[PDB]
Amino acid sequence: SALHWRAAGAATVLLVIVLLAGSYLAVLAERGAPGAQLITYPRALWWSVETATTVGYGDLYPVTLWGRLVAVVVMVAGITSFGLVTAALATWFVGR
């Protein structure tokens, strides 16, 4: 457990924190906007996961300024996490 494992390990933990907080903040931001569908927590968590994994079906998405702002954080933290693990497994193989 040097640096190339603690980084990916913390990123995975941080990601889960972002997913939980992101789904919570999304509901807070999306409510008050007529037509918004991202207004309940259980499906907001499902949205955050498919957002952080860059899947993004289209069944759920933010339509507000702060809602979309929260979404961007979920994307970046998502790509970084899934990208930091990739760079982690790369360094592992290089050192044999």
Give min distance, CB of 87 to K ion, in A. Answer: 11
Query: In this structure, is the dihedral angle defined by the CA atoms of residues 15, 50, 23 and 41, taken in order, positive or negative?
Result: negative
Compute how many other C-beta atoms are within 10 angstroms of the C-beta atom of residue 43: 15
Length of the chain, in residues: 96
Which position among 14, 21, 33, 63 is part of the footprint of its own copies (CB under 8 A)? 63
Residue 4 contact among K ion, its own copies, none, beta carbon within 5 to 8 Å by kind: its own copies
Kindly report the backbone phi and psi dihedral angles of residue 17, in degrees, each rounded to the nearest multiple of 5, phi listed first.
Answer: -65, -40
By CB under 8 A, name the binding residues for its own copies: 2-4, 7, 46, 49-51, 53-59, 61, 63, 68, 71-72, 75-76, 79-80, 82-91, 93-96
